[PDB]
TrEMBL record:
This is Transient receptor potential cation channel subfamily M member 5. Signal peptide: none annotated. Residues 11-200 form the TRPM SLOG domain. It is found in: Membrane.
Length: 371
C-alpha cells in the first residue's frame, strides 16, 4: 500500500512480513524514481540512552559529509527509533541541504503511536511514540531487513553492488539478530554500547566464554541483571558468532591515531571479498568506490598485492571511468597493471571521451559553435 504524509510529503510502503524482497526493491525504485545504489550501509544499533562523544560524532559527521560529497549511498536507518537516530536524521537532512545520499526508514508499525490514525492526506501523528520527522521516507509494516540485505547483496559489464552494516551503541537484544548476520555473508564493523563488549570479547585464547560473559555483563550496563540461563545462551551465541572472524572487524576512532572513516570501510570490504572469492569481476564495484574516494594506497597494497590476477580485458570500463574523472594516479596504476593503451584506445572510444566533455567547459562551447 502506497501513502503520503504532507508534513514535504514522506512516502509510506506497506510492509507485510515475509514479503518478496525483490518486490519491495522494484516498488521502491519504480515509485520513488531514486538513483541506483552505489553502496548500502545499514544501521543495527540505536538507543535513547546512547550518547556519542564529540570525536566519534565528528568522525561520523565528516564521514557522512565525504559520503554525500562524491559517492552517495543508502543509510538503512530504522524509523521510530527515537534517540540518537533523530539527531542523525536532522544532520543528514542539513548536510544534503548543504549524486546524493538517501535514508530509508525501514520500521515496524507496532511501536509507532497513532498507528490507527495512519492506518485509516496528511496523517497528523503529533505525539509528545511518533517517528522522527527528519526523514523524508519510510516503510510501514529483523528478518525483513536481513532478507533485504541478502537480496541486495545478490543483485548484479557485470557489476555488483556492495552492502555493509554499521552498528553504534547497540543493546544486548540485537545479538541474536547479529548471529543471523554472520550467516548472511555481510561484513560488519564495530567501533558506545555493547560494541565495546563484542570487541573486547572477539579475540581471546579461550574460544568459549562461560564466565567472562558474566563479568562483562556486570561491568557493562549494570542496571539490568539477567538470568544465568540467558547468559549461557548468549555465551553460546557469541561463540557461534565469533566462529567466523573474517567478516567482522573492529576499530577504535578515539585512539587519536585513527585512519579516516572511508578508509576502514573499504579495508573491511576488501577483507570480506578476499575471503568470499578471488574473482577479478568481484572487486570491481568496491574498486570503483576507491576511485570515488581517491584512495590509491589501499588500492595498490590490498587489491594489487598480486593475490588476484588481472587481465587487460576487464579493466576497460574502470579505466574509462578513471580517465573521465581526471585521476591520473589510478591511470598510471592500471597501465602498470598490464593494461595496454595501444589496443584499448579506439576511434569510437576516443569519440566517447570527447562525448564525455563537461558542458560548462570551454571546449564544449567551442566544439558546439563550430558544429
Ligand atoms: Ca564485490
Amino acid at each position: 500500500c502506497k501513502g503520503e504524509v504532507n508534513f514535504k510529503r514522506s512516502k509510506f510502503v506497506k510492509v507485510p512480513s515475509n514479503v518478496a524482497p525483490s518486490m519491495l526493491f522494484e516498488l521502491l525504485l519504480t515509485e520513488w524514481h531514486l538513483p541506483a545504489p552505489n553502496l548500502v550501509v545499514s544501521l543495527v544499533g540505536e538507543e535513547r540512552l546512547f550518547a556519542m562523544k564529540s570525536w566519534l560524532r565528528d568522525v561520523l559527521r565528516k564521514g557522512l559529509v565525504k559520503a554525500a560529497q562524491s559517492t552517495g549511498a543508502w543509510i538503512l536507518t530504522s524509523a521510530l527509533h527515537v534517540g540518537l537516530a533523530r539527531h542523525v536524521g536532522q544532520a543528514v537532512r542539513d548536510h544534503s541541504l548543504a549524486v546524493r545520499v538517501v535514508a530509508i526508514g525501514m520500521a515496524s508499525l507496532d511501536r509507532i503511536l497513532h498507528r490507527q490514525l495512519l492506518d485509516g492526506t496528511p496523517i497528523h501523528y503529533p505525539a509528545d511514540c511518533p517517528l522522527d520527522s527528519n526523514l523524508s521516507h519510510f516503510i510501514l509494516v529483523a528478518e525483513l531487513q536481513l532478507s533485504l540485505e541478502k537480496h541486495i547483496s545478490q543483485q548484479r559489464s557485470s557489476i555488483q553492488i556492495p552492502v555493509l552494516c554499521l552498528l553504534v551503541n547497540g543493546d544486548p537484544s540485537t545479538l541474536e539478530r547479529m548471529s543471523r548476520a554472520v550467516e548472511q555473508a555481510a561484513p560488519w564493523l564495530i567501533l558506545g554500547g555493547i560494541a565495546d563488549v563484542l570487541a573486547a570479547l572477539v579475540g581471546q585464547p579461550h574460544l568459549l566464554v562461560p564466565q567472562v560473559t558474566e563479568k562483562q555483563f556486570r561491568e557493562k550496563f549494570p542496571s539490568e541483571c539477567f538470568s544465568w540461563e540467558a547468559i549461557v545462551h548468549w555465551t553460546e551465541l557469541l561463540q557461534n558468532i565469533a566462529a567466523h572472524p573474517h567478516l567482522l572487524t573492529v576499530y577504535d576512532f578515539e585512539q587519536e591515531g585513527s585512519e579516516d572513516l572511508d578508509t576502514v570501510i573499504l579495508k573491511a570490504l576488501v577483507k570480506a571479498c578476499k575471503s568470499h572469492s578471488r574473482d577479478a569481476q568481484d572487486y570491481l564495484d568496491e574498486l570503483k568506490l576507491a576511485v570515488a574516494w581517491d584512495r590509491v594506497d589501499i588500492a595498490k597494497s590490498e587489491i594489487f598485492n598480486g593475490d588476484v590476477e588481472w587481465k587487460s580485458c576487464d579493466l576497460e570500463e574502470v579505466m574509462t571511468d578513471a580517465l573521465v574523472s581526471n585521476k591520473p594516479d589510478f591511470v598510471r596504476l592500471f597501465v602498470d597493471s598490464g593494461a595496454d593503451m595501444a589496443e584499448f584506445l579506439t576511434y569510437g572510444r576516443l569519440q566517447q571521451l570527447y562525448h564525455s566533455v563537461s558542458p560548462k567547459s570551454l571546449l564544449f562551447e567551442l566544439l558546439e559553435r563550430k558544429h
